[PDB]
């Protein structure tokens, strides 16, 4: 009965566009770093924009350990490759 | 460009795999310019860092 | 900058005690499954109990990719070893 209730990451629009291959918040570019997550029910990763801030979360029924680990790994790799700071 | 360990504009030697705080650039209080400068000396063992 | 604002897991008190070597919620056993994470600004893991449900989170300034990935990995390994269903 172990569940993950929140896996949320916060970014700015510029950095998200850098890591989404220049595509804006609402959709996920297939060539970007947010594509390839395993889909248990629909889109595993969703992104929203508000006041210049982009929120990237794992979907409600896709929050298994593998998706969380892959998202964290891809965020770290993209930040290091693109000289972005992954603050704790 | 800023000296290593200092976060300014165009910094190139800031730590990337560790949480860091920029090295102090000037002392505060009544310290005058020459005495207000900061130099960071490192007493370290060979295992303090890994490349 | 890329930051994590929520890394929250939910389980039962019995399951948490199984994972925490039988210790209650407001204590992380050094020999348990939730000890050994990287301490950046104190205790990397904080657990609370309410209405028979235990919430395990990463502290505010300890939410790097390594802590999240290791917590997910340890949760998966402990759930598989102790036959606890990771329903998420």
CA–CA gap between residue C38 and residue B17 (Å, rounded)? 13
Cα dihedral across residues A86, C60, A61, A1: positive or negative = positive
Q: Which residues of A fall within a CB distance of 8 Å from C63?
A: 88
Q: How far is C21 from chain A (nearest CA, A)?
A: 16
State the count of interchain CB pairs (< 8 A) between A and C.
Answer: 99
User: Would the CB atoms of A75 and C15 count as touching at under 8 Å?
Assistant: no
Q: Three-state SS for C31?
A: coil
Contact C78, C84 (CB under 8 A): yes
Cα(C59)–Cα(C6) distance, rounded to whole angstroms? 9
For A32-73, give the secondary structure using H, E and C.
CCCCCCCCCCCCCEEEEEECCEEEEEECCCCCCHHHHHHHHH
Resolution of the solved structure (Å)? 2.8
Quickly tell me which residue has 């929250």 as its tokens.
Answer: C8
Residues of C whose CB is below 8 A from A86: 1-3, 64-65
Measured in degrees and rounded to the nearest 5, phi and psi for residue C54 equal -105, 130
Asked if A77 has any chain C CB less than 8 Å from its own CB, the reply is: no
Degrees to nearest 5, angle at CA C16 with C12 and C17: 120
Q: Do A58 and A45 touch, CB atoms closer than 8 A? A: yes
**In this complex, do C4 and A6 lie within 8 Å of one another by their Cβ atoms?**
no
**Residue recorded with tokens 């019995």:** C14
Can you tell me which residue has the tokens 């950046």? Answer: C40
| Size (chain B), residues | 51
């Amino acid at each position: 009965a172990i569940t993950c209730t929140a896996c949320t990451f916060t970014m700015t629009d510029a950095e998200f566009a850098i890591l989404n291959e220049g595509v804006a918040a609402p959709t996920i570019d297939p060539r970007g770093s947010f594509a390839g997550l395993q889909s248990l029910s629909g889109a595993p990763i969703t992104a929203s924009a508000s006041a210049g801030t982009t929120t990237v979360v794992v979907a409600a029924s896709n929050r298994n350990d593998a998706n969380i680990r892959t998202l964290a790994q891809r965020l770290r790799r993209a930040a290091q490759a693109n000289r972005i700071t992954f603050t704790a | 460009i800023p000296t290593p360990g200092v976060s300014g504009a165009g910094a190139l030697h800031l730590p990337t795999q560790d949480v860091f705080t920029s090295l102090p650039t000037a002392f505060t209080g009544a310290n005058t310019g020459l005495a207000a400068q900061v130099i960071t000396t490192l007493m370290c063992h060979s295992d303090w860092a890994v490349m």
